[PDB]
């Protein structure tokens, strides 16, 4: 139980919290949206050209 209680943070939750802190600071320091509804860059996507 002691060994399991002191297992190192390999699941990277502290890292993720610090990363989110950096991102939030930078994004509302610049007036940018906190999150974008697009996960991937729309300039790297090539949709089929015609839809009808």
């Amino acid at each position: 139980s002691t060994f399991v209680a002191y297992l190192p943070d390999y699941r990277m939750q502290e890292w993720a919290r610090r990363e989110a802190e950096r991102l939030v600071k930078y994004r509302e320091a610049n007036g940018l949206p906190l999150m974008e509804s697009n996960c991937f860059d729309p300039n790297k996507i090539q949709l089929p050209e015609d839809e009808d």
Binding site: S1, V4, A5, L7, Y10, R11, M12
Partner: protein, 459 residues
Amino acid sequence: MLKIIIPTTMLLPMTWMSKHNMIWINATVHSLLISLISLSLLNQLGENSLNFSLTFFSDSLSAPLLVLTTWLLPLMLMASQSHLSKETTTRKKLYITMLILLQLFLIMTFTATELILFYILFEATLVPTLIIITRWGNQTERLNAGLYFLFYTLAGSLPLLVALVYIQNTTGSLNFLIIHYWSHPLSNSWSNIFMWLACIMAFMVKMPLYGLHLWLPKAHVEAPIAGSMVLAAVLLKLGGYGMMRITTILNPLTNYMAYPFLMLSMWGMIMTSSICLRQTDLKSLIAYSSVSHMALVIVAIMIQTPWSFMGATALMIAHGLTSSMLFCLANTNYERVHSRTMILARGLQTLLPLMATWWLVASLTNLALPPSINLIGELFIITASFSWSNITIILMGMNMMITALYSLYMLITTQRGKYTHHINNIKPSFTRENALMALHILPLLLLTLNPKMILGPLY
């Protein structure tokens, strides 16, 4: 994964070359040591599974299951050595050998990289279990139970074999990583419908799904105590683990192929819980309870959400601990009075107080008292099901009530009232039995402090 596996194999000649009066001591010590070493698989990377080699890998889904297996072996040894005292040295070594081979097959099955190896080990677990049931089973009915356990399982698993070799012919691989990264949708055709059924029915019969569950009361009731312990704690979870792995190649068909299995599992949840209310046998009651719990797990896996997968993992682990504890508790009384009937011995709290405390705690975790991990799993599954459809709460709500009812019914019938006047051979509890109960219970309570460990990959 080799570090865990070789010592387990070593256990085999260590018990075959031990003195006649030291087999239990040696096996228990080194089983516990193996369990400690295994404890180190709980460190998980996060984004991906730990791939030790081409053949073996461990997951956050996998790590909890392996630790439970390795921990269950010494408990089975403690529970067995009482009723096996009259046995010859060679037959005791054979029994321990069966248990060790079962542990070895189980560890490999959970960590195999590809499906064909998983299938072979998942099927190899049948032989030691069958031998244990039919050779060391107390009753005449054990032979029938063995046949039911074998045939129900093979009738599901052979179509799975055909489906797997077909899938490797069409895809080129059965390695789970390649299977995941190169996943493509399953069209809606009769061929794909039957491929889905052949991929699902083996794990359904392992769970067991309601209506294909008749083998379980027979096999779990007619088995010796260690056989029952491993059948309820670990062997039921093969179906859940296999289903969680296999449902990655089945999308988007699961969206509507899951309807009949969801209906069966919810209504049969209600059905098996109600059955537990009118049961004259005490092992029969614990078996049907296991069925009811696994119905919940089937629902969670079929609806395919992150919360449902987390709840399913937690419920599998918690059920494995609680069900083993309940079987051991029933076996102590059976050892006293040599009958399984529940109303034979009554008012046992007056004669055995600490065992009554163990009974109360096991009954409280069976009805999922907060903040135990039984309730964590059940609550997560119930929330996911609510999102799936708000009407599931009625069935879920009803099940919670019936479970409390039969759990406390069992507790009240066996522990309360007045003692049967005629039975006068109820001796004090042995240190072995109390330690067995504590070694079941302490780990469950400890798990509440760190819930994420048993949560799974989705976490």
